[model samples]
Target chain A: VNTPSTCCLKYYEKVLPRRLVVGYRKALNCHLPAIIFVTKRNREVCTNPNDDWVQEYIKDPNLPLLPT
Target chain B: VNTPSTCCLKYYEKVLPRRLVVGYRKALNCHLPAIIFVTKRNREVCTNPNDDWVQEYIKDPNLPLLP
Candidate 1:
């Protein structure tokens, strides 16, 4: 909820949504963007940020769930 | 010398300039672009790809050296 001005609005577009990610620093060489995400969360709720479902969930927080 | 069609001409824009880099894949979500670089080179020539000089070299292969 406490987001910074330069915060990537698309942070949720990555794996760990609901939590938060902040820009760490651009990789010194490639200028590849890197970030820091909080790891203090429930294991069942958050795992590897690079896994498939994490990505899917980030894409759409309401996925694989059907409305009644 | 032999580059791929989709080769990031900017591959040199990273570390290990003389070596080559190829697109590994579009990281699943966030669509982060990832790549693979050859690592079978001499230690003296190449070290951490994230170091400052590597980035400077990639930015302009002609750096710190008198023209």
Candidate 2:
């Protein structure tokens, strides 16, 4: 038997771009571990580091400091 | 000694409007419980239920079912 996907996942897939930006915001604010975990777990579909959203945060001069 | 709020919370506050919109989108797709929890816990400053961002999702016609 086959199963259908949940609407939640479908919606997540659709708005993933926005989520990626949010993740970057969180990462900028020091949630890098969370993003790292997510990307590692879902490497296939997780936001690419090269994505514009990631670049935006990467280029953000005002971003806070995090563990080096 | 005094303590300072983390930039994370500050950033969260600054972008909370957008986050609320994102929450509403999640709620529309059946993440109401999560939003409800967040709003209830942060009622003092979390997104207002009456905000335009929330109104948009509450008014969504094509939204999916929720618990």
Query: Judged by TM-score, which candidate is best?
Result: 2
> Whole-model Cα lDDT per candidate?
0.28, 0.28
List, residue by residue over A1-68, the lDDT tens digit for candidate 1.
Answer: 11011112122333554444221221112222222233334222213334575444445533332111
**In candidate 1, what are the lDDT values of residues B1-67, reduced to their tens digit?**
1100111212233345444322122211112222323333411222333457544444553332221
Candidate 1: Cα lDDT at B57:
48
User: A1-68 in candidate 2: lDDT tens per residue?
Assistant: 01111111210122243333322222222222122112223322222344555456546674432331
Docking class of 1: incorrect
Error of 2 at A25 (Å): 11
DockQ of all models, two decimals each:
0.02, 0.02
Pairs that collide in candidate 2 are none
Error of 1 at B24 (Å): 5.2
Error (Å) of candidate 1 at residue A9 is 16
Residue-level error in angstroms, candidate 2, position A49: 17
Candidate 1, residue A27: lDDT: 16
Score candidate 1 by TM-score against the native.
Answer: 0.17
